[PDB]
Amino acid sequence: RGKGG
Amino acid sequence: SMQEEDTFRELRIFLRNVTHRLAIDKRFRVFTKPVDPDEVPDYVTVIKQPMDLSSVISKIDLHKYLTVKDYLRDIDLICSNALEYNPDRDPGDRLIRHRACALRDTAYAIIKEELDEDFEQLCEEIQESR
């Protein structure tokens, strides 16, 4: 989950 | 009637124009296409109703929106999905969230300035009669 970094 | 179909055609024109203006804004590039399951296979395990600006255009053209309230539910969905899929405090996620909220706020502001409330009411009344 999460795209950032 | 033909007059009701004219109404909905005007709605679609209005919605395409609003969506185009969102889609050309550099901040909202990440919302212009579906999240690619080949690149983000995790996405569907979290997000059960993907939505993006291209899919919004496809829905307008398919006559799926009979009111601006229904369009806004899908803009709300692009935003809520980004907040749900990218909730962490890292800057990349904060940036996507800020942009999601800007997309929502911008769509609502354009609609506030440019949608005639009686036009929307008419759309709602036609939809309710079907």
Author numbering:
A (entry chain B): 3 to 7
B (entry chain A): 979 to 1108
Task: Please quote the authors directly.
All ATAD2 orthologs share a characteristic N-terminal AAA ATPase domain and a C-terminal bromodomain. However, in contrast to FACT, Atad2 bears a bromodomain capable of specifically guiding the protein toward acetylated histones where it could act as a molecular motor thanks to its AAA ATPase domain.
We previously found the preference of ATAD2 bromodomain for multiple acetylated histone tails, and we had observed that mouse Atad2 preferentially binds to H4K5ac. Consequently, we focussed on H4 acetylated on K5 and K12. As described for other bromodomains, water molecules occupy the bottom of the acetyl-lysine binding site. However, apart from these conserved interactions, which are also shared with the binding mode of the isolated acetyl-lysine residue, the binding mode of the H4K5ac- and H4K12ac-containing peptides outside the central binding pocket is highly diverse. In contrast, the interactions with H4K5ac were more optimal, containing a number of main-chain and side-chain hydrogen bonds, as well as a salt bridge interaction between H4R3 and D1066 (upper right).
